[PDB]
Protein backbone atom coordinates (compact mmCIF):
# COMPACT_ATOMS: atom_id res chain seq x y z
CA UNK A 1 0.00 0.00 0.00
CA UNK A 2 3.11 2.23 0.63
CA UNK A 3 6.28 0.18 -0.24
CA UNK A 4 7.20 -3.58 0.12
CA UNK A 5 10.42 -5.43 1.23
CA UNK A 6 13.50 -6.98 -0.51
CA UNK A 7 12.13 -10.59 -0.46
CA UNK A 8 13.73 -13.33 -2.67
CA UNK A 9 10.42 -13.59 -4.64
CA UNK A 10 10.25 -9.75 -5.31
CA UNK A 11 13.88 -9.89 -6.63
CA UNK A 12 12.97 -12.82 -8.94
CA UNK A 13 9.89 -10.87 -10.24
CA UNK A 14 12.25 -7.85 -10.58
CA UNK A 15 14.51 -9.80 -13.03
CA UNK A 16 11.45 -11.04 -15.00
CA UNK A 17 10.21 -7.41 -15.16
CA UNK A 18 13.64 -5.98 -16.25
CA UNK A 19 13.93 -8.72 -18.94
CA UNK A 20 10.42 -7.83 -20.31
CA UNK A 21 11.25 -4.08 -20.36
CA UNK A 22 14.31 -4.91 -22.56
CA UNK A 23 12.04 -7.04 -24.89
CA UNK A 24 9.61 -4.05 -25.08
CA UNK A 25 12.39 -2.12 -26.89
CA UNK A 26 12.21 -4.44 -29.97
CA UNK A 27 15.91 -3.59 -30.74
CA UNK A 28 17.85 -5.63 -33.36
CA UNK A 29 19.20 -8.00 -30.63
CA UNK A 30 15.62 -8.50 -29.27
CA UNK A 31 14.46 -9.28 -32.87
CA UNK A 32 17.26 -11.90 -33.39
CA UNK A 33 16.46 -13.65 -30.08
CA UNK A 34 12.61 -13.53 -30.61
CA UNK A 35 12.87 -15.57 -33.87
CA UNK A 36 14.77 -18.24 -31.87
CA UNK A 37 13.09 -19.64 -28.73
CA UNK A 38 15.86 -17.89 -26.69
CA UNK A 39 13.60 -15.11 -25.20
CA UNK A 40 10.71 -17.53 -24.29
CA UNK A 41 13.36 -19.93 -22.77
CA UNK A 42 14.87 -17.13 -20.55
CA UNK A 43 11.37 -15.80 -19.52
CA UNK A 44 10.09 -19.34 -18.64
CA UNK A 45 13.20 -19.86 -16.41
CA UNK A 46 12.60 -16.43 -14.71
CA UNK A 47 8.82 -17.19 -14.34
CA UNK A 48 9.56 -20.59 -12.67
CA UNK A 49 12.07 -19.03 -10.19
CA UNK A 50 9.46 -16.35 -9.23
CA UNK A 51 6.73 -18.97 -8.49
CA UNK A 52 9.24 -21.29 -6.68
CA UNK A 53 10.40 -18.43 -4.36
CA UNK A 54 6.71 -17.33 -3.90
CA UNK A 55 5.59 -20.84 -2.73
CA UNK A 56 8.54 -20.98 -0.28
CA UNK A 57 7.71 -17.48 1.15
CA UNK A 58 3.97 -18.23 1.78
CA UNK A 59 5.03 -21.54 3.48
CA UNK A 60 7.34 -19.73 5.97
CA UNK A 61 4.72 -16.93 6.36
CA UNK A 62 2.19 -19.51 7.76
CA UNK A 63 4.78 -19.96 10.62
CA UNK A 64 3.74 -16.44 11.80
CA UNK B 1 -4.78 -19.80 12.15
CA UNK B 2 -3.12 -17.69 14.93
CA UNK B 3 -4.48 -14.19 13.92
CA UNK B 4 -8.27 -15.02 13.64
CA UNK B 5 -8.50 -18.78 12.81
CA UNK B 6 -11.62 -19.69 10.72
CA UNK B 7 -11.39 -16.42 8.64
CA UNK B 8 -7.57 -16.53 7.91
CA UNK B 9 -8.09 -19.80 5.88
CA UNK B 10 -11.11 -18.04 4.24
CA UNK B 11 -8.36 -15.57 3.06
CA UNK B 12 -5.70 -18.10 1.83
CA UNK B 13 -8.09 -18.82 -1.10
CA UNK B 14 -7.80 -15.07 -2.10
CA UNK B 15 -3.93 -15.15 -1.91
CA UNK B 16 -4.24 -18.44 -3.88
CA UNK B 17 -6.18 -16.61 -6.70
CA UNK B 18 -3.71 -13.65 -6.80
CA UNK B 19 -0.77 -16.12 -7.46
CA UNK B 20 -2.85 -17.82 -10.20
CA UNK B 21 -3.43 -14.37 -11.83
CA UNK B 22 0.37 -13.59 -11.83
CA UNK B 23 1.23 -17.01 -13.30
CA UNK B 24 -1.47 -16.54 -15.99
CA UNK B 25 -0.10 -13.00 -16.76
CA UNK B 26 3.50 -14.33 -17.24
CA UNK B 27 2.13 -17.19 -19.48
CA UNK B 28 0.01 -14.73 -21.63
CA UNK B 29 3.24 -12.74 -22.28
CA UNK B 30 5.26 -15.84 -23.44
CA UNK B 31 2.21 -16.95 -25.50
CA UNK B 32 2.18 -13.54 -27.25
CA UNK B 33 5.93 -13.81 -28.14
CA UNK B 34 5.43 -17.37 -29.55
CA UNK B 35 2.53 -15.95 -31.68
CA UNK B 36 4.95 -13.22 -32.94
CA UNK B 37 7.46 -15.95 -34.04
CA UNK B 38 4.68 -17.65 -36.15
CA UNK B 39 3.30 -14.35 -37.57
CA UNK B 40 6.82 -13.58 -39.07
CA UNK B 41 7.07 -17.07 -40.73
CA UNK B 42 3.56 -16.51 -42.25
CA UNK B 43 4.92 -13.24 -43.86
CA UNK B 44 7.47 -15.33 -45.89
CA UNK B 45 10.14 -12.58 -45.58
CA UNK B 46 7.96 -9.49 -46.32
CA UNK B 47 8.34 -6.40 -43.99
CA UNK B 48 7.42 -7.07 -40.30
CA UNK B 49 7.17 -3.28 -39.56
CA UNK B 50 3.34 -3.50 -38.91
CA UNK B 51 3.70 -6.75 -36.83
CA UNK B 52 6.35 -5.01 -34.60
CA UNK B 53 4.06 -1.96 -34.01
CA UNK B 54 1.14 -4.29 -33.04
CA UNK B 55 3.38 -6.43 -30.74
CA UNK B 56 4.75 -3.26 -28.99
CA UNK B 57 1.20 -1.90 -28.33
CA UNK B 58 -0.15 -5.32 -27.15
CA UNK B 59 2.96 -6.07 -24.98
CA UNK B 60 2.56 -2.66 -23.18
CA UNK B 61 -1.06 -3.65 -22.16
CA UNK B 62 0.06 -7.19 -21.09
CA UNK B 63 2.88 -5.55 -19.03
CA UNK B 64 0.32 -3.12 -17.39
CA UNK B 65 -1.91 -6.08 -16.34
CA UNK B 66 1.15 -7.94 -14.93
CA UNK B 67 2.21 -4.91 -12.77
CA UNK B 68 -1.41 -4.36 -11.49
CA UNK B 69 -1.71 -8.10 -10.47
CA UNK B 70 1.85 -8.00 -8.92
CA UNK B 71 0.79 -4.90 -6.90
CA UNK B 72 -2.42 -6.65 -5.70
CA UNK B 73 -0.40 -9.81 -4.70
CA UNK B 74 2.12 -7.74 -2.64
CA UNK B 75 -0.78 -5.97 -0.77
CA UNK B 76 -2.46 -9.35 0.00
CA UNK B 77 0.79 -11.01 1.26
CA UNK B 78 1.32 -7.96 3.57
CA UNK B 79 -2.08 -8.47 5.38
CA UNK B 80 -1.64 -12.30 5.60
CA UNK B 81 1.80 -11.43 7.16
CA UNK B 82 -0.14 -10.41 10.36
CA UNK B 83 -3.76 -11.63 9.42
Swiss-Prot record, chain B:
Domain of life: Eukaryota
Post-translational modification: APOE exists as multiple glycosylated and sialylated glycoforms within cells and in plasma. The extent of glycosylation and sialylation are tissue and context specific. Plasma APOE undergoes desialylation and is less glycosylated and sialylated than the cellular form. Glycosylation is not required for proper expression and secretion. O-glycosylated with core 1 or possibly core 8 glycans. Glycated in plasma VLDL of normal subjects, and of hyperglycemic diabetic patients at a higher level (2-3 fold).
Effect of residue 61 to A: Decreased binding to LDL receptor
Effect in UniProt of substituting residue 54 to C: In HLPP3; ApoE2-type
Region (LDL and other lipoprotein receptors binding): 58-68
Start-end of each Sequence repeat: 2-23, 24-45, 46-67, 68-83
Locations listed in the record: Secreted; Secreted, Extracellular space; Secreted, Extracellular space, Extracellular matrix; Extracellular vesicle
Modified residue annotations for Phosphoserine: 47
Effect after changing residue 54 to S: In HLPP3; ApoE2 Christchurch; decreased binding to LDL receptor
Tissues expressed in: Produced by several tissues and cell types and mainly found associated with lipid particles in the plasma, the interstitial fluid and lymph. Mainly synthesized by liver hepatocytes. Significant quantities are also produced in brain, mainly by astrocytes and glial cells in the cerebral cortex, but also by neurons in frontal cortex and hippocampus. It is also expressed by cells of the peripheral nervous system. Also expressed by adrenal gland, testis, ovary, skin, kidney, spleen and adipose tissue and macrophages in various tissues.
Sites bearing Methionine sulfoxide, chain numbering: 43
Substitution effect: residue 24 to V: In ApoE3 Basel
Effect in UniProt of substituting residue 76 to C: In HLPP3; ApoE2, ApoE2 Fukuoka, ApoE1 Weisgraber and ApoE3**; ApoE3** is associated with HLPP3; changed protein structure; decreased binding to LDLR and other lipoprotein receptors; decreased in vitro binding to heparin; no effect on distribution among plasma lipoproteins
Resulting phenotype, residue 62 to P: Decreased binding to LDL receptor
Binding-site positions, heparin: 62-65
Assembly behavior: Homotetramer. May interact with ABCA1; functionally associated with ABCA1 in the biogenesis of HDLs. May interact with APP/A4 amyloid-beta peptide; the interaction is extremely stable in vitro but its physiological significance is unclear. May interact with MAPT. May interact with MAP2. In the cerebrospinal fluid, interacts with secreted SORL1. Interacts with PMEL; this allows the loading of PMEL luminal fragment on ILVs to induce fibril nucleation.
Family note: Belongs to the apolipoprotein A1/A4/E family.
Summary of the function given for this chain in its UniProt record: APOE is an apolipoprotein, a protein associating with lipid particles, that mainly functions in lipoprotein-mediated lipid transport between organs via the plasma and interstitial fluids. APOE is a core component of plasma lipoproteins and is involved in their production, conversion and clearance. Apolipoproteins are amphipathic molecules that interact both with lipids of the lipoprotein particle core and the aqueous environment of the plasma. (Microbial infection) Through its interaction with HCV envelope glycoprotein E2, participates in the attachment of HCV to HSPGs and other receptors (LDLr, VLDLr, and SR-B1) on the cell surface and to the assembly, maturation and infectivity of HCV viral particles. This interaction is probably promoted via the up-regulation of cellular autophagy by the virus.
Disease: Hyperlipoproteinemia 3: A disorder characterized by the accumulation of intermediate-density lipoprotein particles (IDL or broad-beta-lipoprotein) rich in cholesterol. Clinical features include xanthomas, yellowish lipid deposits in the palmar crease, or less specific on tendons and on elbows. The disorder rarely manifests before the third decade in men. In women, it is usually expressed only after the menopause. Alzheimer disease 2: A late-onset form of Alzheimer disease. Alzheimer disease is a neurodegenerative disorder characterized by progressive dementia, loss of cognitive abilities, and deposition of fibrillar amyloid proteins as intraneuronal neurofibrillary tangles, extracellular amyloid plaques and vascular amyloid deposits. The major constituents of these plaques are neurotoxic amyloid-beta protein 40 and amyloid-beta protein 42, that are produced by the proteolysis of the transmembrane APP protein.
Note: Binds to and activates LILRB4 on acute myeloid leukemia (AML) cells which leads to suppression of T cell proliferation and promotion of AML cell migration and infiltration.
Protein name stated in the entry: Apolipoprotein E
Gene source species: Homo sapiens (Human)
Portion of the full-length sequence here: 101 to 183 of 317
Amino acid sequence: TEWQSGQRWELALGRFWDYLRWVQTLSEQVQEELLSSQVTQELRALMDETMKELKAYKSELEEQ
Amino acid sequence: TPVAEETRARLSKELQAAQARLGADMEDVCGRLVQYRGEVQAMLGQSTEELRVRLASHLRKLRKRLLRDADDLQKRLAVYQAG
